[PDB]
């Protein structure tokens, strides 16, 4: 019911869908953002090497620095998801 | 590679829609309940 | 190197509403069936 | 109506106050979180070396990895502020 809208990305297409999948899996498991956030960061640390970070929520803003081709910002439903690599 | 950038959420749109829909349902609900109570008395 | 998380004091007013609509929608459907069920006896 | 409450910290005391000051300055300048977020990240990049990241908001959760003695999570009013180093 909660369809995927990518607001911004500097990332490969494969990885972008793979983020959107994770986010979806995480949201089937956990209701709490902190926990969705950890689920994803962890999965990406494994597949694509450290060091990823991930913020999940509805009313926040950010300023961050990422590695080339390792950044995504997208909504899964009315919930925003920031995921990116630095370290 | 090093890229600095920011994000901002835009939530808040469609809230009156919900607020107004709750009001609607609450009201329909109370009135439906009374109809039930009224008919249970009959049967 | 220290991995950790945060969470804000839950939660949005909008989730509150979303969840309240869900609740009412559901109570409603169920209340209507009860009516028809008595309306079927009448 | 905007007193400082530290929820969690792994940081020096000087730095911690200094964050709380930045946050305060930023919020005198900018209403938008994104922008408050940038103000701080930038300032800490300057004073304490890169690479900092900063998330500012009210309804979000996170999972992140930080450097030893470079992490703070605190509220300035009803607005939460995450700031930390990872490069």
Author numbering:
A (entry chain A), D (entry chain B): 3 to 89
B (entry chain D): 130 to 172
C (entry chain C): 131 to 172
Lines from the paper:
In order to understand the positive contribution of Val-5 to DYNLL binding we crystallized and analyzed the DYNLL2 complexes formed with the monomeric Ac-SRGTQTE peptide and with the Leu-zipper dimerized GSVSRGTQTE peptide (where the first two residues originate from the recombinant construct). Crystal structure of the complex formed between DYNLL2 and Leu-zipper dimerized GSVSRGTQTE peptide complex was solved and refined to 2.9 Å resolution. Overall conformation of the DYNLL2 dimer and the binding region highly resembles to that of the Ac-SRGTQTE complex structure. The DYNLL2 dimer and the interactions within the two binding grooves are symmetric. In contrast, the coiled coil region of the Leu-zipper diverges from the symmetry axis of the complex due to asymmetric crystal contacts of its two α-helices. Different backbone conformations of the four-residue linkers in the two peptides as well as their elevated thermal factors indicate that the linkers are flexible suggesting that the Leu-zipper does not interfere with the binding interaction. The bound SRGTQTE segment of the peptide preserves the 5 backbone hydrogen bonds of the β-sheet interaction and the 11 additional hydrogen bonds of the high resolution complex structure. The Val-5 residue extends the β-sheet establishing two backbone hydrogen bonds, while its side chain is accommodated into a shallow pocket formed partially by the His68 imidazole ring, which is also involved in binding the Arg-3 side chain through an H-bond. Indeed, ITC measurements verified that the most abundant in vitro selected residue at this position, Val-5 significantly increases binding affinity. Both the structure of the Leu-zipper dimerized VSRGTQTE peptide - DYNLL2 complex as well as modeling studies (unpublished results) showed that the apolar side chain of Val-5 packs against His68 of DYNLL2, while the Val-5 main chain forms two H-bonds with the protein further stabilizing the antiparallel β-sheet structure of the complex. In the crystal of the dimer-to-dimer complex, due to crystal packing, neighboring GSVSRGTQTE-DYNLL2 units form antiparallel β-sheet structures.
The LC8 dynein light chain (DYNLL in mammals) is a highly conserved 10 kDa protein that was originally described as a potential cargo binding adapter of both dynein and myosin 5a motor proteins and as an inhibitor of the neuronal NO-synthase enzyme. Subsequent studies demonstrated that it binds to and regulates dozens of other proteins unrelated to the cytoskeletal motors. It is now considered to be a eukaryotic hub protein. Apo- and ligand-bound structures, determined both by X-ray diffraction and NMR spectroscopic studies, revealed that DYNLL forms a homodimer possessing two identical ligand binding sites. In the complexes two 7-residue peptides bind to parallel grooves at the edges of the dimer interface expanding the two central β-sheets.
